[model samples]
Target: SMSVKKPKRDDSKDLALCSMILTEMETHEDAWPFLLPVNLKLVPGYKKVIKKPMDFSTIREKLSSGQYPNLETFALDVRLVFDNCETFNEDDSDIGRAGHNMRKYFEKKWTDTFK
Candidate 1:
């Protein structure tokens, strides 16, 4: 006989899920602008405008290094990538368009996998 109660913490699952999502994001078509940290020379003032810059490469590094404490923190950093884009780029611009597209992709995946 076995008593079954399942309400324990599950970090392993979150790690896998977040990793999967991050990998997919890397391969996305519009992921070019977000693949690495913004160029300070090309996008001068970016460092100043986006106080906390975030990118796919950084997110991947954090994930692989076990820097994120929870799924929520991981998701927050991913969203920050788009938030910074919205703040810095114009809506009709290529980078801004890509940011919107990528954000939509992530949100859908988030809901499908976690929500």
Candidate 2:
């Protein structure tokens, strides 16, 4: 009888990338945008939850298992937060500017590592 082989996370670079994503993501303010990247941090995963607060850790835990189909897809998934966040197109509002800068950071720099 023939059997299929299981795949695994063999790419060291990808693993590093995943860790980098989590590290940088953990550094941004969850509610405010930054004038500079200095000491930037984001709202914890638990805080980003909708409807309920339970299972918040599960979000990142699930992400820990790198079973993605490809690099591009994985990269896109990590940046989903930025894409879904409020653009805050205005240049005045603090919250809006924060969100905008956070999104912009991901937009302008996220791909720099992988590309």
Candidate 3:
């Protein structure tokens, strides 16, 4: 059969989320991002144990071009980025809470922009 299936409203949300994260990492230019948890020894999908460095400049190009199908998956990937880094650790520090807040920021952005 020559019939074909359309995109089926594939979660274009990832595209949007991609844009958000890309902007922050690029323009923000924080060393912390360099410090963020990403395996630097290899590219993504090589092996779970292998390390890969994070690259937002490339991410921006991909996302703007609709690389990711949905924001949900992209966000999870981002959370991994954040988790790979070691931030200030202490009950009397915003570092811990702030890390959680980063996740919230994207959630809100996705909701506000897409929803």
Comparison by lDDT, 1 against 3, better one: 1
Candidate 2 regions exceeding 4 Å error are: 1-11, 30-59, 87-95
Q: How displaced is residue 54 in candidate 1, in Å? A: 0.5
Question: In order, what lDDT does every prediction score?
Answer: 0.93, 0.49, 0.51
lDDT score, candidate 2, position 114 = 61
Better of 2 and 3 by lDDT: 3
Best by lDDT: 1
- In model 2, pairs of residues that clash are 27-40, 27-41, 28-41, 28-42, 29-41, 29-42, 30-42, 30-43, 33-98
Q: TM-score of model 3 relative to the true fold?
A: 0.45
Ranked by lDDT from best down, the candidates are 1, 3, 2
Model number with the top TM-score: 1
Alpha-carbon RMSD of each model: 4.2, 8.4, 6.8
Candidate 2 residue lDDT tens string, 40-114: 135444244422221113324545775565666655654544433443234465655665666566655556866
State the local distance difference test value for candidate 3: 0.51
